[PDB]
């Protein structure tokens, strides 16, 4: 019966029986709310835009209702009103869609087709394999689909890029732009983002660094407070890295037993300045190893920084390096090794600098390096503190000597087993205001300069050293003013084969201050009596010193003492044959052949005695 | 039976039994049934649970309120609770009346119900917002299309982060941790990118991004990129206490134009007094660059500025009336520091620009009217000069004799500078200690030149391979020069012009022929124009091969005197009988060139005697 | 028939054709039909697609399990997959029995289906959580109301960030990047605000926020705000290796009360030994302040503390038994540093407080029993004094003669201090180089005062316009003073009291009348009480206008001796026969005032000779 069918259709759409009609080519649609196609057995809501007299024309399988007025897609209107038919079966069985309001199930979720009809779906299809999802293709419909899509997006990583973010909302801030939460979160990189974990050896964080750097990331932070094990050697750093610890809590640590293991490399492409790789910063972290390693190897590099780094058994090795700063670092069993033989052009490295560092058992060993500078540092114990060497050495006339400057200022060197300073090839150096107490364990000088030229060593204190406080060997044309040499085992200041040095002011002796000293037996000694041009002026010697000065001050040596306490001013004296050849006017000479003083008279051009008589 | 057929199709619709559907009729017992039908309205509604036997139907209105024996029930309300709805034929656009709570009206392919009082009339061309809004007591959206559109809107319009509650550490419960929003937590940091910044090499004007970020109240601003942030709008005023942080020295803030008068940033106090100086801030870990030479920052009436790990390229820093500025771990290429004080109309002095651990190439430091410039542990290479000081007000009035200010230069290296490494005018109370200077070769200039100096100390420096003298002092007085080395300079080691009361002690002069460069220095110390007085040389170790070790007039009236300088005569007391000193110290020894003998002043006899103790003739 | 009619009604509901609906009857061929009807339960169900011809029906139970000749199918499960549901009468609160997977039961205007064993009896008064829970195998929410409510709860209850998966760089696929959660990524950083901190000027007690933040294990804590964070609970103990980071020096951590005994933070080791010292941390980029004077931090038994770009106001730092502490780029206003060591019951010493690039006004540095205080590149203005050192344990036993410690003061400026710039007691091995001092004018005090000094060097400093002497040395021995300038001081340049064996070399004294302030200095160098010995002046350039250049007893027994100081006579060896030196070097020259002649020593004969060679 048509009446009962119209009636149950009315119940479905929530309308009145009076308001339903069968499509019939020639009816006045006006007034009806729902139309029924008896051929397809589908019902459709009618557009509110229906005027009396508009009569049917043709109603097709696509539910396109052609009437007198114009035409209407009843399927499209049905989607608009969320009035759907869920087809039997599924994408897997396949089916054909003819109307915009037909749904097809895939995996317990429904889809409608937004493209051209009819749409045939072959058996074994999925929405993706049959047009994909989007405007003009498959669009998901309904509860199950929305739930799955939300669960999937939240759980698969895609959600943060779909959330728009703007700084300061809900406040409207002039100039703030829309970004995504993904973008904003990506403003920072932690090692953890690349699988890093401070789990004390379970994770190989070497690979996390490698991957992080390969992504283009440069500034990498450590979240943890524990030990990040490193197990793959020779990770190459990118130019201008910055690795940031969590407030000096976490360690980047090698936990193995291979002393050849190296954590990181930094490598330029060749020896010239345009080939040096730009370094970066390590800060606020511990670099450590249970065995001694060279933790980083830099070759052909410039502008490296380490700030607030704690190094444990981890030596830094650089070869052909240019400007490196260690600031506020703590170095335990962790040497600095600088070389330049890879610089095949000039055979030089430049400016390793240490500021506000503390070191224990951590020597600084630089060869063929210009302008090593150490300022406001404390170095404790170790075999030695500072060593310099020159491996070129062999000069060609008119050059007479090869070497480089160090600058060492207001630093403390204490309880070093050997020399605090073992400086070979020191040229134009300035060494000012330091405290040195070293060498006791090996009966070594506190400081030893072998091969020095044109340098200044000013205002330093050498105390309680294992031999001399300071020994100068093969040093020329250099100044030593205001230095104190106290309580040293064998002597204060010693020279060997030096030439043209000034030793001015300061003081030598023993002051017996609580905390350690020897009774120093010698002040200044030219130990092998073979220096010339050594000038001592104004030095305050402790009267109790057994030997204040040992120095040959005979007339041809050019060695001379003036106003040094407990030592006479050098007197020109000698035999008649050793009278000077070109004396200044009124020159006074004590003639040991005659046993009298004599004076050079420049007008007569003769030596005379005190009574005015010519001698000779 | 048509009633029965209708009852049946309704039972199918609700999933109930056929006999559980009842028509409304006044008086009928409602117990047991599940669904009631209104024959007038032609609507069905689920009945509420628990209608006990005896309850009889009384009335049912167009709003689907059912009245019965034991009370009443809003069947529209019940239907909403069970998500049992009717979608009316219209839309908000054609207009409709809403009579019951479970009727839905379509707006833009989405459904809404009315949560207000009923009936609800809706004129054509209405919307949920125009007809009472959306929320409790008004329109509430219902169903799939609505929820999908609202979620899409929410997620895409920026409001979502503020709705997500966040607490640090969850799901762990951390004592003291508070609830915030994701929005809040994300806003804890500001990147230039948040205000439109982009390192796209000139497409974006990042000057505006800085201006907008600062105006928001942001102070600490980070750069995310590794490329070039182009700057195209001049004179962006910095707030007090900014911090601009680059991405590990990778990105550049760069001027790409051709106007050499462009300036990126200004920092400007409100006047010249200390409580009016604007508090500066920090630039760190980045490159400040320009293709043409510019003054990239101009500070006027400012205090407490820091630059740390900044690489400057063609970018000069210009400050006028400034107080305490630090450059630390900077790399300065073609990038001058220019300090002035004429805007300080109170004292006309600026204070304490300080450089530490810097490397400079072609980047002079040029300060006028500035007290306590300090350079420590720095390297300066090339350039026209490295350090220049000047005093504008060379205007003193007696009893004042001189005007100037101190510099402190310590353990720094100045190398291959084309002119003077140090060009110091008006240098007073300065300390210059432990430095290396090799400068002036390209222009035949002194390594260092002090013109107008008072009461200063220059100690333990090395001047080597300089283009004229290592160091020249002109109009310097009451100053000490101890332990300095002067090696292999073109013309001489140390020179004086019109100086007074200087001590030159120790150190050494000569040439040591070290591989890397030197001249054969022909002169040690020279009083170049023979017009200085009170110049005291003591204990200086001269290379014997020096042609002229000392050039100095040591006659009695000059007060110039030499003692223990190798290869140089000591200044001896000597002269004619007429020139015997008038008030000699006790036992004074004088070589009398008239007599050709030494004589001694005896303070007891009050006479000059020879060595035999006889008085010499003396009127 | 009514069966025909019911089938038609059902067909409309499912959107199928009338002949595609079938009643379950045992034995029927099921193929071809789309919907089946159970006439007993009066429920309809979609049939699964593709039942093959000849598949005959066996049974259909109250669970809607359809058993047939080829197998069985759960039509309830299929209904769920197609979102074809029945909403039961009633609710969880009234109770019900669930028999089929596609039955829904309402609770709180939301629907649930049962995913567990059927049937499921729900007792009256139930809720989903009370009647089995929500999740797989239990209750599962269905539909619009439920989903809306669940979305609102999940965003608002704090659990959402941990549910959102995150990976760095998406949608780009970055090798090595791992999945984390948004919660994890946000938790990478800690602000004080996360623990309730607020810069609301006293309303919030931020002391407690810090306590809670550190108790969580967090170490690096950031301040978001630019205002005042009030602190109201005293003695918050810092963890080891904290880092507190201000917002670019804008915010203040401030005490707003009136109790001068209030202390913000403590850092406390477990005892005096090196393995018991607590590792400190960093404060940076912030203001520490109080309206009344307080000791804002108290450190006891501590090592490795840093303060960088901190502005201190009325806030003294007090450390007792401390080892290595750095203040860099700090501004100190009315904010003393107080260093002590009496809590070190082992050695009674503290070590290496260091100041670099600091500015201070009215903020003295007062350290007792402390080795190696170092001040470099600093400026100190005003205050009662700038730098003070003291020794508590002054008494010594033979062979010790003296107790004290080094200070290192380099290239720093001390100006307009009311009393002494430097008040140094027990100064041993100190190096004081390249400083500028102008102090004491307000109290007629010396610019610098060293009382008890040994084996130290003071080089290349300038002392100008001080309130008495530029520098006074009292009880100083075996020390060097080279290249210093003493200008324009009220009473004198350099003074000594009870000293022994000092060298004073070069530099200059006088007044240069430079605009900006000076006195007319009346005295150069003075041995003020005429009781020092072994004082050696060499090469000092004195202003000719000085009224008294040198005040010093240079008689033969005092070992005091002047050479080449302008305007001062050179010291001549002279005196009575009784005071002739015993056994001096050969040809030593002495003016014998008893005989009124010079005489020369002949070492071999052990006799004095006159200039004619005769014994005297
Ligand atoms: Cl990062
Ligand atoms: Cl690699
Ligand atoms: Cl003569
Ligand atoms: Cl602006
Ligand atoms: Cl006499
Ligand atoms: Cl606590
Ligand atoms: Mg129906
Ligand atoms: Na290796
Ligand atoms: Na307290
Ligand atoms: Na007295």
Three-state secondary structure string covering B51-72: CCCCCEEEEECCCCEEEECCEE
**How many other C-beta atoms are found inside a 10 Å radius of the C-beta of residue A519?**
14
CB atoms within 10 A of CB A608: 18
Distance CA C110, CA B82 (A): 7
Using a 10 angstrom Cβ sphere, with 0-12 exposed, 13-18 middle and 19 or more buried, the burial of residue B155 is middle
What tokens were used for B467? 């283009």
How far apart CA C225 and CA C194 sit, in angstroms, is 12
Residue C26 sits in which domain range? 2-82
Q: Alpha helix locations (H) across A131-235?
A: 143-156, 159-162, 181-185, 205-214
Helix (H) / strand (E) element for C75: namely helix C75-81
* Pairwise CB contact (< 8 Å): A571 & C559: no
| Chain C nearest-CA residue for A40 | C17
3-state SS class at B389: strand
B562 CA from centroid of ligand 3 (Å):
18
Note every long-range contact of B256-260, with CB atoms under 8 Å and residues 24 or more positions apart, other chains counting: B256/B201, B256/B202, B256/B228, B256/B230, B256/B231, B256/B232, B256/B290, B256/B291, B257/B232, B257/B292, B258/B292, B259/B292, B259/B294, B260/B292, B260/B293, B260/B294
Task: Indicate the helix (H) or strand (E) that contains B150.
Answer: helix B144-156
Sheet containing strand B71-74, strands side by side: B57-60, B65-68, B71-74
Task: Please tell me which residue of chain C has the smallest CA distance to A160.
Answer: C166
CA dihedral B255→B258→B261→B266, nearest 10 degrees, is -20
| Structure token pair of residue A164 | 């728009």
- Region for residue A488 given its phi and psi (left: phi exceeds 0; alpha: psi -120 to 50; beta: otherwise): beta
Give the C-alpha distances (Å, rounded to integers) separating C108 from A494, B512, C138, C206, C223: 98, 99, 18, 43, 44
- Pairing between strand C607-609 and C597-602? antiparallel
Q: What is the DSSP letter of A359?
A: E
As a whole number of angstroms, the distance between CA B91 and CA B145 comes to 15
Report chain B residues whose CB lies below 8 A from the CB of A163: 155, 160-161
Contacts of B282 (CB under 8 A, 6+ apart): B242, B243, B244, B245, B306, B307, B308, C248, C309
Burial of A2 (0-12, 13-18, 19+ CB in 10 A): exposed
Which residues in chain A touch residue B483, judged by CB atoms under 8 angstroms apart? 456, 458, 479-482, 502, 504
Spatial distance between the Cα atoms of C266 and C305, rounded to a whole number of angstroms: 12
Tokens at residue B50, please?
Answer: 């628990």
Q: Say if strands C71-74 and C65-68 run parallel, antiparallel, or are unpaired.
A: antiparallel
Burial tier of A547 (Cβ tally within 10 Å: 0-12, 13-18, 19+): middle
> Strands A421-427 and C379-381: what pairing?
unpaired
**In the beta sheet, which residues pair with residue A560?**
A535
Closest CA to C242 of C265, C206, C214: C214
Partnered with residue B21 across adjacent β-strands are B35
C-alpha C529 – ligand 10 centre gap (Å)? 4
Are the Cβ atoms of A458 and B434 closer than 8 angstroms? yes
Helix axes C144-156, B144-156, angle to 10 degrees: 20
Are A331 and A352 contacting, i.e. CB atoms less than 8 angstroms apart?
no
Contact B155, A164 (CB under 8 A): yes
- Distance (Å, whole) CA B106 – CA B100: 15
Q: Is the CB of B176 less than 8 angstroms away from the CB of C215?
A: yes
Counting beta carbons within 10 angstroms of the beta carbon of residue A58, is it exposed (0 to 12), middle (13 to 18) or buried (19 or more)? exposed
Ligand 2 center–CA B329 separation, angstroms: 28
> Residue holding tokens 């962790």?
A334
Give me the DSSP letters along C533-601.
EEEEEES-EE-TT-SEEEE---SGGG--EEES-TTSPPP--EE-GGGSPSS--TT-EEEETTTTEEEEE
* Chain A CA closest to residue B184: A168
Whether residues B399 and C513 touch (CB distance < 8 A) is answered with yes
Q: Quote the CA–CA distance of A488 and A508 in Å, as a whole number.
A: 10
Question: What would the two tokens of residue B362 be?
Answer: 């072609």
Nearest to C290 by CA among C333, C240, C256: C256
DSSP-derived secondary structure for C186-201: HTTS-BGGGGT---ST
Q: Say which residue the tokens 């020897």 belong to.
A: A518
The experimental method, as deposited, was: X-ray
- Residue C123: how many CB atoms within 10 A of its CB? 10
Residues of chain B in contact with residue C90, where contact means CB-CB under 8 angstroms, are 49
User: C491 near C520, Cβ under 8 Å?
Assistant: no
The CA R_g of chain B, rounded to the nearest whole Å, is 47
For residues B194-230, b (16+ Cβ closer than 10 Å) or e, as one string? bbbbbbeeeebbbbbbbbbbbebebbbbbbbbbebbb
Burial profile C10-19: b = 16 or more Cβ within 10 angstroms, e = fewer: bbbbbbbeee
CA of C238 to the centre of ligand 9 (A): 15
Contacts of B61 (CB under 8 A, 6+ apart): none
* Distance between CA atoms of residues C94 and B94, nearest Å: 42
CB A319 within 8 A of CB A290: no
Taking CA atoms, A395 is separated from A390, B515, B520, C588, in Å, by 12, 7, 17, 46
On chain B, the residues whose CB falls within 8 A of the CB of C513 are 399-402
Displacement of CA B536 from its chain's centroid (Å): 48
- Cα B584 to averaged position of ligand 10 atoms, centre (Å): 30
**List of chain B residues whose C-beta atoms are within 8 Å of the C-beta of residue C166:** none
> Is the CB of residue C413 less than 8 Å from the CB of residue C380?
yes
Ranges assigned E (strand) in C11-94: 21-23, 35-38, 43-46, 57-60, 65-68, 71-74, 86-87
CA pair distance C234, C261, nearest whole angstrom? 9
* Resolution of the coordinates, Å: 1.9
How many helices (H) and strands (E) in chain C? 6, 53
- Residue B34 alpha carbon to ligand 1 centre in Å: 64
User: B400 and C461 in contact by Cβ < 8 A?
Assistant: no
Interchain pair B176, C196: CB under 8 A: yes
CA separation, residue A374 to residues A305, A310, B357, C432 (Å)? 15, 18, 11, 17
What are the residues facing A12 on neighbouring strands?
none
Q: Is C486:C463 a contact under the CB 8 Å cutoff?
A: yes
Torsion angle, alpha carbons of B584, B589, B592, B596, to 10: 160
Question: Coil, strand or helix: which one is C163?
Answer: helix
Q: Which of B69, B406, C330, B562 has its CA nearest to residue A562?
A: B562
Cβ proximity of B433 and C411 under 8 Å? yes
E strand spans, C329-372: 331-333, 337-340, 350-356, 359-361, 365-368, 370-371
Tell me if A195 and C176 make a contact (CB, 8 A cut-off): yes
Please report which ligand is nearest the Cα atom of A295. Answer: 8
Q: Could you give the 3-state DSSP secondary structure of residue A191?
A: helix
In whole angstroms, give the CA distance from residue A521 to residue A64: 119
Separation of alpha carbons C616 and C614, rounded Å: 6
**Burial (Cβ within 10 Å: 0-12, 13-18, ≥19) of residue C560:** buried
Report the alpha-carbon distance of residue A521 to residue B484 in Å, rounded.
Answer: 30
Asked if B540 and A538 come within 8 Å (Cβ–Cβ), the reply is no
Residues of A in contact with B361 (CB under 8 A): none
Local structure of B352: helix, strand or coil: strand
* Contact list, A599 vs chain B (CB under 8 Å): 591, 597-598
Residue C172 DSSP one-character state: S
Alpha carbon distances (Å) from C97 to C85, C92, C106, C135:
15, 10, 13, 19
Which candidate from A181, A479, A560 shows the least CB-CB separation from B507? A479
* Measured distance CA(B435)–CA(B414) in Å, rounded: 8
Q: Any residues with CB less than 8 A from the CB of C186 and at least 6 apart, and which?
A: A185, B166, B168, B182, B185, B186, C161
Radius of gyration of chain A (CA): 47
Distances (CA, A) of B324 to A526, B304, B429, B592, C357: 49, 5, 19, 61, 10
The answer to whether the CB atoms of A173 and B216 lie below 8 A apart is: yes
Residue (of A361, A425, B612, A253) closest to C616 by Cα position: B612
Can you tell me the distance from the alpha carbon of A441 to that of A417, in angstroms, rounded to the nearest whole number?
5
- Residues making up chain A, counted from first to last: 616
Token couple for C229: 């964070």
Closest CA to A55 of A26, A84, A79, A77: A26
Cβ(A46)–Cβ(A32) under 8 Å? yes
Reduce the DSSP state of residue C474 to 3 states and report it. Answer: strand
Nearest to C415 by CA among C436, C435, C433, C438: C438
Give the 3-state secondary structure of residue C2: helix
Nearest to A146 among B89, B147, B514 (CB): B147
Query: What DSSP string runs through B535-588?
Result: EEEES-EE-TT-SEEEE----GGG--EEES-TTS-----EE-GGGS-SSPPTT-
* Residue pair A100/A76 in contact by the 8 Å Cβ criterion: yes
- A400, B514: Cβ pair inside 8 Å? yes
Q: Indicate the length of chain B as a whole number.
A: 619
d(CA B547, CA B539): 18
C171 prior amide bond cis, ω within 30: yes
Residues C510-525 as b or e (16 or more Cβ within 10 Å = b): bbbbbbbebbebebbb
Q: Which chains touch B (3 or more CB pairs under 8 A)?
A: A, C
Longest Cα–Cα distance in chain B? 171
CA of A157 to the centre of ligand 1 (A): 20
Which residue from A minimizes the CA distance to B411? A407
For residue A278, what are its two tokens? Answer: 């730009």
Token code pair at residue C86? 């029945």
Do you know the residue count of chain C? Answer: 616
Tokens of C406: 């080094």
Distance CA B300, CA B278 (A): 8
Cis peptide before C431 (omega within 30 of 0): no
SS3 assignment, position C97: strand
Q: What is the CATH number of the domain that holds C62?
A: 3.30.2020.50
d(CA B201, CA B259): 17
Q: A-chain residues within 8 Å CB-CB of B194?
A: 167, 176-177, 179, 184
Task: Answer yes or no: do A186 and C167 touch at CB < 8 A.
Answer: no
B13 annotated as belonging to a binding site for a ligand = yes
A123 DSSP assignment: T
Residue whose pair of structure tokens reads 């240098």 in the numeric block: B427
Give the neighbours of chain A: at least 3 Cβ pairs within 8 Å: B, C
C-alpha of B543 from chain center: 50
Grouping H, G, I as helix, E, B as strand and the rest as coil, residue B13 is helix
Q: Which of B484, B580, C23 is nearest to A482 (CA)?
A: B484
The answer to whether A128 and A159 are in contact (CB under 8 A) is no
Q: What residues of C are designated binding site for Mg(2+)?
A: 13
For residue A521, whether the previous peptide bond is cis, meaning omega lies within 30 degrees of 0, is no
Separation of CA C84 and ligand 7 centre (Å): 14
Cα–Cα distance measured from residue B9 to residue C506, given in angstroms and rounded to the nearest whole number: 121
Partner residue opposite B403 with nearest CB, options C190, C515, C538: C515
Say if residues C505 and C538 touch (Cβ distance below 8 Å).
Answer: yes
**Do B182 and C183 lie within an 8 Å CB cutoff?**
no
Contact between C222 and B188 using a beta-carbon 8 Å cutoff: yes
Residues 6+ apart with CB under 8 A from C471: C437, C446, C447, C448, C449, C450, C458, C463, C484, C486, C493, C494, C495
Nearest-CA neighbor of C411 among C386, C390, C437, C440? Answer: C437
Spatial distance between the Cα atoms of B561 and B547, rounded to a whole number of angstroms: 20
Which of C243, C117, C234, C158 is closest to C192 using CA atoms?
C243
The Cα–Cα gap between B114 and C512 comes to 95
Could you say which of B13, B213, B591 has the minimum Cβ distance to residue A175? B213
| Chain C hits for B482, Cβ within 8 Å | 459-460, 482-483, 505-507
Å from CA of C248 to ligand 7 middle: 71
In whole angstroms, what separates CA C514 from the centre of its chain? 43
Tokens standing for residue C345: 């019951």
> Which among C400, C422, C430 has a CA at the least distance from the CA of A507?
C430
Indicate which ligand has the atom closest to the C-alpha of A612: 3
- E strand or H helix at C237: strand C236-237
Helix axes C2-14, B2-14, angle to 10 degrees: 40
C59 phi, psi to nearest 5 deg:
-155, 160
Residue A495 to residues A454, A500, B321, C117, C187, Cα–Cα distance (Å):
15, 11, 52, 101, 64
- β-pairing, B86-87 vs B96-98, is unpaired
Number of Cβ within 10 Å of residue A139's Cβ equals 18
Residue B396 buriedness (CB in 10 A; 0-12 / 13-18 / 19+): middle
C60 pairs with which residues across the strands?
Answer: C66
Rounded-to-integer distance, Cα B38 and Cα A186, Å: 61
């Amino acid at each position: 019966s048509i009446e009962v069918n119209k009636q149950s259709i009315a119940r479905n759409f929530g309308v009145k029986e009076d308001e339903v009609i069968y499509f019939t080519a020639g009816i006045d649609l006006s007034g009806f709310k729902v139309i029924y196609d008896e051929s397809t057995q589908r019902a459709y809501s009618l557009p509110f835009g229906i005027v009396s007299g508009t009569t049917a024309i043709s109603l097709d399988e696509r539910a396109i209702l052609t009437h007198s007025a114009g035409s209407v897609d009843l399927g499209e209107l049905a989607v608009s009103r969320e009035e759907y038919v869920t087809l039997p079966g599924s994408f897997n069985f396949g089916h054909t869609i003819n109307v915009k309001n037909e749904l097809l199930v895939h995996d317990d979720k429904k889809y409608r087709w937004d493209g051209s009809l009819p749409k045939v779906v072959a058996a074994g299809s999925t929405p993706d394999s049959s047009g994909g999802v989007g405007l003009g293709a498959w669009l998901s419909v309904g509860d199950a689909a929305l739930r799955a899509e939300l669960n999937t997006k939240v759980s698969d990583g895609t959600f943060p890029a779909t959330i728009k973010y703007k700084y300061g909302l809900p406040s409207v801030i002039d100039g703030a732009i829309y970004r995504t939460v993904q973008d904003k979160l990506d403003d920072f990189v932690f090692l953890e983002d690349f699988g890093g974990k401070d789990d004390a050896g379970s994770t190989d964080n070497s690979i996390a660094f490698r991957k992080a750097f390969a992504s283009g990331a440069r500034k990498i932070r450590l979240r943890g407070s524990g030990v990040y094990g490193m197990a793959t050697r020779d990770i190459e750093l990118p130019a201008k890295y910055e690795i940031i610890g969590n407030a000096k809590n976490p360690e980047i640590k090698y936990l193995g037993t291979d002393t050849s293991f190296t954590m990181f490399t930094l490598t330029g492409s060749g020896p010239a300045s345009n080939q040096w790789k730009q370094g970066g910063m390590f800060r606020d972290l511990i670099i450590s190893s249970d065995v001694k390693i060279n933790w980083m190897l830099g070759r052909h590099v410039q502008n490296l920084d380490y700030d607030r780094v704690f190094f444990y058994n981890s030596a830094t090795v650089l070869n052909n390096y240019h400007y490196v700063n260690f600031t506020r670092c703590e170095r335990w069993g962790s040497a600095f090794i600088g070389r330049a033989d890879l610089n095949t052009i000039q055979f030089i490295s430049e400016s390793p600098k240490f500021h506000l560092c503390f070191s224990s058992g951590s020597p600084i060993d630089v060869w063929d390096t210009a302008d090593l500078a150490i300022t406001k540092c404390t170095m404790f114990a170790g075999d030695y503190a500072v060593r310099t060497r020159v491996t070129q050495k062999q000069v060609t006339a008119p050059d007479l000597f090869a070497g480089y400057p160090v600058l060492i200022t207001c630093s403390v060197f204490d309880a070093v087993r050997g020399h605090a300073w073992d400086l070979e090839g020191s040229v134009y150096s300035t060494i000012t205001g330091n405290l040195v107490s070293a060498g006791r364990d090996t009966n070594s000088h506190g400081a030893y300069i072998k091969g020095g030229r044109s340098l200044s060593l000013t205002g330093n204190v050498f105390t309680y050293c294992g031999n001399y406080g300071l020994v100068l060997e093969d040093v020329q044309q250099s100044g030593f003013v205001g230095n104190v040499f106290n309580g040293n085992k064998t002597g204060g200041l010693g020279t060997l084969a030096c030439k043209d040095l000034s030793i001015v002011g300061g003081s030598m002796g023993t002051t017996y201050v609580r905390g350690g000293y020897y009774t120093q037996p010698v002040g200044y000694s030219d130990i092998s009596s073979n220096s010339t041009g050594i000038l001592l002026s104004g030095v305050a010697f402790d009267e109790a010193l057994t030997t204040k000065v040992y120095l040959d001050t005979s007339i041809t040596t050019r060695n001379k003492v003036i106003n040094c306490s407990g030592v006479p001013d050098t007197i020109a004296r000698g035999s008649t044959a050793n009278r000077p050849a070109n004396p200044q006017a009124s020159y006074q000479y004590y003639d040991t052949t005659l046993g009298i003083p004599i004076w050079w008279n420049s007008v007569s051009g003769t030596w005379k005695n005190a009574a005015g008589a010519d001698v000779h």
